[PDB]
Design a binder for this molecule. Sequence first.
Ligand code: ZN
Lengths: 73, 254, 60
Amino acid sequence: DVSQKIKDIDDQIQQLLLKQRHLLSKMASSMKSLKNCQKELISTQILQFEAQNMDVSMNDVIGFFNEREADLK
Amino acid sequence: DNPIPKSVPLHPKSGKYFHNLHARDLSNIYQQCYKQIDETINQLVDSTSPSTIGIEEQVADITSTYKLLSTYESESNSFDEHIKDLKKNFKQSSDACPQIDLSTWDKYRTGELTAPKLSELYLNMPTPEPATMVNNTDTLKILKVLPYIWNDPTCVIPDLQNPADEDDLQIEGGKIELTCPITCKPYEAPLISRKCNHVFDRDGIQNYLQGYTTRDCPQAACSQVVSMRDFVRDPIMELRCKIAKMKESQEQDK
Amino acid sequence: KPFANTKKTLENQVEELTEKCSLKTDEFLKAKEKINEIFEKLNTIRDEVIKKKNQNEYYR
Ligand SMILES: [Zn+2]
């Protein structure tokens, strides 16, 4: 009857081989979601860089503006 | 009206922020995805229950995600290329613009002077697909062939330099030998040549080229001058022998 | 001066974008972690196969 254990364990192997194929599908899906986060991160960062670059520029000009006044008098 | 300009050039203090802009590297993750893929065909081949079905389904599923992942990767590689170019173009365009000052600031606001706007240049990138080459990845050939060699480890596979090409293979007649032409014994460490598609067992050419710099290819002394470096490991041939050995093994105990 | 108000609105937007980048970073690192959990589940399953195998190798 020991001829049966070789079949159940041989089937379990098959169920596990299937599960691998399913998880491999999830993995690819997961990758796609990762690429989206990566894309969204770089986008938000470029906006931040712009706004922040405009900010330090504003600081400069304001600094110069206040000079034409504090010296004008 | 228009209190703030449409754009201003790259400020010296923003140099480091601009420099650090890049899309997050995924090379390491893609690598593991492919490795995970590989390890799956191995266990598949090595643990699939007795044939008479081939494995055409399993292979179809795996190749489906493999190509998906590969489609994703190409987009990622393309993404970096575009980011880098767009940035290089921005920096050069930004560097020709006058710095911001009491006079300059009004000009950038009014439009007299115009600086490049990275956010817009970013949104308006090429965006084509695939834009790359149908790389002949070693792991793609195994998938293409696998179903055919499973049901017949000797079936003569004809020329394939562009796998993934949904089309059936021109399976010739007869059958190839799972035995090294320089040992006349079944393989155990198949090696394929790069400049010619001849496969010899490792100890075959290992001793054939042993003591020599560049001897002509053993097979009918095939013109191709060869060396050990020209011999890669043959996954396809190893698959064949692997399968044959499993068939012989399954013929005795089933 | 004539800037005070706009500049204020500008400083805040930069503050908001900064928190946004921080969020997208954690969101991105989170996704990275999700896929690593899948590499992990794939790896363990393979170990099971290797073991169920060795069992039959022994014939039981
Ligand atoms: Zn040759």
